[PDB]
Amino acid sequence: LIPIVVYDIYSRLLRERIVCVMGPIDDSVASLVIAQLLFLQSESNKKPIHMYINSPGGVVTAGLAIYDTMQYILNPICTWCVGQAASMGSLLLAAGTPGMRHSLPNSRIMIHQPSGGARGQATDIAIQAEEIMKLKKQLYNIYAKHTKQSLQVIESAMERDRYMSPMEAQEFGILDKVLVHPP
Amino acid sequence: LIPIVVAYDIYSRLLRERIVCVMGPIDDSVASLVIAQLLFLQSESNKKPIHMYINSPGGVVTAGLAIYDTMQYILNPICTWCVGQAASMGSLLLAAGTPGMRHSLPNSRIMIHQPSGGARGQATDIAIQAEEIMKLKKQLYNIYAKHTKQSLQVIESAMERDRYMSPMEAQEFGILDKVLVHPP
Amino acid sequence: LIPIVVAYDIYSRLLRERIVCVMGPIDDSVASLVIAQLLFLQSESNKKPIHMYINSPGGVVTAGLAIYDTMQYILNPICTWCVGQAASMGSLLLAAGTPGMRHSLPNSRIMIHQPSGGARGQATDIAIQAEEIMKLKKQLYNIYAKHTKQSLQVIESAMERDRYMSPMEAQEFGILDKVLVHP
Amino acid sequence: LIPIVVAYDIYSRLLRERIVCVMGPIDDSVASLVIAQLLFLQSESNKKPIHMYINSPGGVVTAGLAIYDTMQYILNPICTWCVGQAASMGSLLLAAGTPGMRHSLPNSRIMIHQPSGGARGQATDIAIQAEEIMKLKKQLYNIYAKHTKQSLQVIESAMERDRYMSPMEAQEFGILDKVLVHPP
Amino acid sequence: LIPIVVRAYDIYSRLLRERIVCVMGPIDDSVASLVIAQLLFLQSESNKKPIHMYINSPGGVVTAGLAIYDTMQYILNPICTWCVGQAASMGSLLLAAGTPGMRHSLPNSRIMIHQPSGGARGQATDIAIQAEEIMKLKKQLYNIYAKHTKQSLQVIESAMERDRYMSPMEAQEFGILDKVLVHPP
Amino acid sequence: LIPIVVAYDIYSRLLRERIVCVMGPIDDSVASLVIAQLLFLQSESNKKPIHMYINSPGGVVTAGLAIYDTMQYILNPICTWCVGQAASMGSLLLAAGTPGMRHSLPNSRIMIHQPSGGARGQATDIAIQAEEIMKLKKQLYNIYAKHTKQSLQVIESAMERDRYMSPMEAQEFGILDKVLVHPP
Amino acid sequence: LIPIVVAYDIYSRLLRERIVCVMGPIDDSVASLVIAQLLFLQSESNKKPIHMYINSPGGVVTAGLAIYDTMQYILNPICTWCVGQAASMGSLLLAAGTPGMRHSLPNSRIMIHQPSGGARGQATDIAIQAEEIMKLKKQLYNIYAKHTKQSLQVIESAMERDRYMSPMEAQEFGILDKVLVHPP
Amino acid sequence: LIPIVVRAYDIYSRLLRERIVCVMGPIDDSVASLVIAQLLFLQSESNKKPIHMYINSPGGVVTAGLAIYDTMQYILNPICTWCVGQAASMGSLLLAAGTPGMRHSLPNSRIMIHQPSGGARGQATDIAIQAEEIMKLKKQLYNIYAKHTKQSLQVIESAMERDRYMSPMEAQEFGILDKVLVHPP
Amino acid sequence: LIPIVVAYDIYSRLLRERIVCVMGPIDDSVASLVIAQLLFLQSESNKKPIHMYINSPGGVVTAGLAIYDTMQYILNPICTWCVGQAASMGSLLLAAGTPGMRHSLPNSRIMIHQPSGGARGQATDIAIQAEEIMKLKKQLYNIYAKHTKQSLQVIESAMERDRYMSPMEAQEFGILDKVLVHPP
Ligand SMILES: O=C1C2=C(CCN(Cc3cccc(F)c3)C2)N2CCCN=C2N1Cc1ccc(C(F)(F)F)cc1
Ligand SMILES: O=C1C2=C(CCN(Cc3cccc(F)c3)C2)N2CCCN=C2N1Cc1ccc(C(F)(F)F)cc1
Ligand SMILES: O=C1C2=C(CCN(Cc3cccc(F)c3)C2)N2CCCN=C2N1Cc1ccc(C(F)(F)F)cc1
Ligand SMILES: O=C1C2=C(CCN(Cc3cccc(F)c3)C2)N2CCCN=C2N1Cc1ccc(C(F)(F)F)cc1
Ligand SMILES: O=C1C2=C(CCN(Cc3cccc(F)c3)C2)N2CCCN=C2N1Cc1ccc(C(F)(F)F)cc1
Ligand SMILES: O=C1C2=C(CCN(Cc3cccc(F)c3)C2)N2CCCN=C2N1Cc1ccc(C(F)(F)F)cc1
Ligand SMILES: O=C1C2=C(CCN(Cc3cccc(F)c3)C2)N2CCCN=C2N1Cc1ccc(C(F)(F)F)cc1
Ligand SMILES: O=C1C2=C(CCN(Cc3cccc(F)c3)C2)N2CCCN=C2N1Cc1ccc(C(F)(F)F)cc1
Ligand SMILES: O=C1C2=C(CCN(Cc3cccc(F)c3)C2)N2CCCN=C2N1Cc1ccc(C(F)(F)F)cc1
Ligand SMILES: [Br-]
Ligand SMILES: [Br-]
Ligand SMILES: [Br-]
Ligand SMILES: [Br-]
Ligand SMILES: [Br-]
Ligand SMILES: [Br-]
Ligand SMILES: [Br-]
Ligand SMILES: [Br-]
Ligand SMILES: [Br-]
Ligand SMILES: [Br-]
Ligand SMILES: [Br-]
């Protein structure tokens, strides 16, 4: 299944201070990722942490749970985009420590405003819609914070799905370095 | 298996007596039929009263408002009659009858509530969808306040949840005018 | 129950008053029936006006444009009437009535939006399908600008997302000319 | 639901005007109805022109070729009219109208492409099935070149993928002769 | 949803007045019954005036087709077969069972002949019985095709082991039909 | 896909730190485990605090109250922490932490609402079923009022519909005590 | 059940030989596992060559491009071996092996073809997805041209439809370097 | 649910210690990977000691089978093939690709060979490409069967046009296996 | 769920006693497990008898014939024991035990019948499929006559339909040798 090395390969990735946030994001991934982060901080709260991101997005609450944990812990977090980073995946990618957010050369990065659904009486529709616009402003604020772009530019760029290449994402402020090979 | 009476079907004879049936759920198909019946009876006579029998659980708001607009357009006096139950858009159509000519049989049930709906898509689309349903709420409440002569406030308070009324209670509320066991 | 009226079913009697019903979703079957009704009423009189009652949520785009092309082809003036709601292709048919004879009942709803679609298959096929959906987007916009007399810029702005309008707002936009509550 | 006019149904009245409708997907059932209408209209008169209204997304090729062969068989001029859309077998029947009498309303879409199909079973059966549809590709390309006056090369280049055209783009390709906003 | 013409019939009953029977679409026991009633009726109005069968079928149930076949041969009238669009499986059989010299096809039709298919399930005795039945069937149909094509059983066995698709002109050479018709006489 | 740490699994390692995870919907299994974990931690120490990480959209009400009753029973200080989301019974357990030790991360969402349910069967059964859901409404309202220090009237008004709060709003309402953007 | 050979399961034993298996469809789950093995083998030695056995019909393009970016990143020579078949993303990883070290067993099949996808929603969204698919096609076309040394016209021409190759044909095209019937 | 024997393994890992690899059951990419790892491992423990393949398969994915085939020919060891119960489609190919003179079958097994099947959908260009591929495949496998059976392609083309079922003794005459084994040496 | 006894699982302990279980439907997977157990027990000792417990409703014939050929291949005496039921391929394996060492518990049911199958496709394919299963009928009848010492005629008469037997009725037919209530 998962290969054993010398002790399974994924626990071996955890010893190198590497956390994988690959695949769709839900509360289960949040629980696992958060527990990995808190663990690495207890072994060393100063030695950097590497988060390998290859995700299409996922549940918004779950991602913001991972986000708050990245910002909470004292370690530098190195984010690395592998394959794809879309929706909340690009949020985790951008929340890496400044100057420590990376991408491999052929990745794709995409940002967009949240989606949702509301059913029920008009009052319930009214409440549910207030919540989705509060969410839209919340995620927008976070992107502007870590991209150092105006909230204004974020609003324009995220109204629809905006796809970027590693270099386009660097200029936009999503990542800092595009790496074809080890330094 | 619609019965034929003496050479008509029972419903075509009912249209001949100037009687329109609004029974069952209301959708555009029901609207289309009822609208055509009303416009036809008005061409025969724009003075002779028209009778509507309502036994509906409600249905699509636009379709109901199409019937509502048609009731208001035609010049005839319209007699509404609640049979069994009149809920949602049914209670609106019932109350939209000509003043003094809105009726109910003794064991009927009447129900009003705010509209319901659904929104899907991006947050931008949700905002748009949600704006429309609050506008519909203000539209239907305004119509109800008009024909009950009640305050918009009472309207809101009552329609926030499902409020079931008895024929007798709906007469106090302003939905109908008369509760009838036998003809006068 | 289609009622029988005095020897006529209620819908054939409506056709005798020169009234054509476009209620419900629009598909090739609806386009077929409406087109046949228009050509017939033009054969009884190529001058006497025809009345189109609209209560539609939209539907198949080609079918709608088939009806639109017929309204413009026949020589009669066509009076359109929105009852209940006329949205998407319904509002186009509403606006395609002859100027000054486009009406609405007081509590109707009118809505306009850009077309939606789907593409599947190889990258080359996706290119072709999207070029087609864009051409349709320009096609419907040009038709909408024509009958509302609104600038193509306003139409582009107004139809990027869904626009719900009241009878009066629609009059202002140029979709209809008259709002009525009584004869 | 078809309206009744005087006294027949509106589609039978349209056949009275020498109008055949080819709307909707094309299968052997439409072929029966279309073929029977054409052969009948010829017995009424082998010279009075016949009008075909096309609003079709395509369909079964043999059924379409059945109509094509019948269009060619009868002696009458055939006026084709594209309304809404004519794609796949529809654009063939549209283009097969009598030269100079092939029409389209201004906002139609016209589309041409090579046939699609499917094969299953042993390799030997697949080989047969693959030969049979290359034969159709050569057949439909030939018919299109014949009536468009285009070269087979052009047909081959144009029909390798879905090629969507505007009414005037098809007039230019040889698919129709006239684009009409209003009656001449 | 059938148009009504001219004393006023539906277009299909008007076709029957012209002595034209449609065997268009798939063949099942319902189509067999309808075609058989139409054949017996037209010989009843005239047992000599030719009868026309319009064929545009992909095949269907074998017994149903052999039921139509047996009636065609039974009635006294000449039967003119016309392939329109397509005639495959039993459809080509009915096409070829027309009276000699009066079997026609429009220019772009397709003709296809093939051996029968079937299925067997159950105990072995049963499987055996069923396969024997299918063999006897292949043989029957092969013999019919030979009789009407005038081809030897050897050519038929070779030609129908797999799906054999033909053009009208190929069908005329093979012996399934006699005339191909580009425009009227 | 659970990693191993030095040698336990990360989740048994969290129990090693006296940290209990209440993530996901709350059902009877979750409750079982959480209760066991809490009791174990009490066994290991009657004084050292216990930490609950709450990231839940709600779930079965009895199940949630089973966890609640356990929190109040055990003597340990209980630190509650909202991560991601704490809604329905999740917000109840969050507010049920020991006073002064209830926390939330900056971008969490908190939501409170009255219970929902269902009734089917005879009128007598509906009456009985409906009496119980009003009893939970009063029970859950009382619990919330206790730990938020809000009057029962303010709770009743706020929980009639879904009430969403941010961490700060929740601090003001009385659900949590501190909003942490980083360690102290 | 995967056998134990000594104590190792045979797949961990293959990782011991610096052999990574890329068999089956490629998705994000394979990508993590493939990437973790590649990164691990480089830490055992950034010089001892790594062998990838490829028997894949393709899969998600981004997931495959994740493996590709990793192959180019690490410093080791990577030996690619086509076993059975390498189609779609499989032939790209295959062609991305270290120059001079890309292999295939005698009876394998190789296929290269342009990416496929889907777009749904408003025309505005359709444009975005259609632009994204065009960039993917140009991106993968560039990658194939880099490692096959073929000009971009030849790639566009060869990948417009499904292009199937034999080991000797793929060797000529530039996808692999050696076809082996036996060890040397 | 595998029994554990004798330092204590499961019965299947104990079979691998005897240099016996099972290709029993249908063949897919998973079976190909498992068999390939087992072959490469046993040549690694000994590249000379013979390897035994137990075959009881109804066939499966063609590429997967040709993947196992290519490995059998690649490794240096003699491979002894043993047909147990049944070997049909690719299963008989793996059976016949054993090293000459070491291809065996138990007395009541069945061997069946047949041409490949497949499917094609889409536009015509695509159908064409796909059928070409299937043809090239028939040819490939036909060539393999000839090489290991020593039969001419003409005999193979004739023999595999339809499902050809054989007895062990018939398979020995045809050239698929060398020895039939009633009881041990 | 299998109990653990000393220390192994109860089925591995049963293999220690030289007991192979053939319970449940027989397919190629049971054949692998049964065949591997027999070949393994022979390497432990080619003379110590082996016991097969049969409680089976039949199954795939080739899988059953795989076990039959292996039973014959090994040198050991095989004691067959019918427990519960042995029908279709089960009664063959039961009767194929070493002469004089084939047993049944008192209340078992034993059944023999001719094989069943299925054929689909062109007539020519049906002919092949029908030949193949008449070959199995002749094969299984022969094996049954061999071990029952019955004539093929009797086998043919008995197996044309389902023939159910009691333990003593099978001893008499040649299917087993001993019916045992209690240990001798
Ligand atoms: O970090 C903490 C935290 C707390 C309580 C606060 N909470 C804040 C928090 C909560 C949820 C998500 C976050 F992002 C942050 C952080 N407590 C309390 C118990 C003793 N320790 C700790 N620790 C060290 C610790 C943790 C886990 C492991 C583990 F790896 F073993 F699981 C080892 C050491
Ligand atoms: O009874 C009425 C009734 C009205 C209007 C009041 N409504 C009250 C009502 C409604 C529903 C249930 C009830 F218990 C009572 C009774 N009107 C008005 C039109 C002329 N006539 C009538 N009649 C006689 C009549 C009816 C039907 C036919 C017909 F179905 F045969 F056509 C002929 C004559
Ligand atoms: O009422 C009208 C109306 C129009 C055009 C306006 N439109 C306004 C309207 C539209 C939709 C819903 C409404 F609420 C109001 C009313 N026109 C125009 C043609 C001649 N007549 C009419 N009439 C009389 C008429 C109707 C129907 C029958 C029939 F039922 F017998 F068919 C006979 C006579
Ligand atoms: O309008 C025409 C048209 C044609 C030829 C097509 N051309 C073009 C056209 C325009 C717009 C939409 C279309 F789809 C097609 C219109 N032709 C030719 C045969 C005689 N008449 C006509 N007419 C009169 C006519 C129609 C129908 C009925 C009936 F429905 F009552 F039967 C009576 C009279
Ligand atoms: O055109 C023919 C045809 C034949 C036999 C040949 N066949 C050839 C053909 C051509 C194209 C497509 C086909 F599928 C078949 C044409 N025959 C024979 C019986 C008398 N008439 C005719 N007619 C006139 C006719 C038809 C039908 C109606 C009716 F449907 F209105 F009844 C009236 C008159
Ligand atoms: O055979 C090889 C092969 C390579 C690379 C080439 N490749 C080509 C090949 C041939 C046939 C089928 C295939 F799919 C691939 C064969 N390499 C490279 C790493 C060191 N060794 C090897 N070996 C020995 C080896 C294998 C496996 C085990 C183990 F299973 F025990 F781990 C030990 C030793
Ligand atoms: O390669 C790295 C890499 C990093 C961080 C950068 N990242 C770049 C990268 C990321 C994703 C895909 C790529 F293609 C490339 C590569 N770091 C940081 C932690 C210490 N080590 C490493 N190493 C050696 C290492 C890795 C994993 C194991 C494991 F086997 F334990 F999992 C052992 C040794
Ligand atoms: O009872 C037997 C029996 C046999 C031969 C079968 N005969 C007949 C039988 C009776 C009742 C139900 C049956 F299904 C079968 C019973 N044989 C032969 C091999 C050595 N031993 C035995 N034993 C002792 C034995 C069993 C099992 C365990 C174990 F489960 F612990 F492994 C230990 C010892
Ligand atoms: O019986 C054999 C057999 C062979 C090769 C022939 N084959 C013929 C055969 C007969 C019946 C059914 C079959 F499917 C195959 C029998 N070989 C070759 C490798 C060394 N040994 C053996 N043995 C002893 C042996 C087996 C297995 C275990 C183990 F499973 F416990 F590991 C230990 C000892
Ligand atoms: Br999102
Ligand atoms: Br409502
Ligand atoms: Br639209
Ligand atoms: Br013509
Ligand atoms: Br086509
Ligand atoms: Br057939
Ligand atoms: Br709740
Ligand atoms: Br691809
Ligand atoms: Br095969
Ligand atoms: Br033996
Ligand atoms: Br059996």
Side-chain angles (χ1 to χ4, degrees), chain D residues 70-78 96-98, chain E residues 183:
Chain D
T70 301
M71 292 181 60
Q72 304 286 110
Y73 180 88
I74 60 165
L75 278 301
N76 310 71
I78 299 152
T98 290
Chain E
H183 298 135

Side-chain angles (χ1 to χ4, degrees), chain E residues 83-95:
Chain E
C83 181
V84 189
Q86 193 207 46
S89 171
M90 295 274 95
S92 59
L93 190 142
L94 295 197
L95 177 63

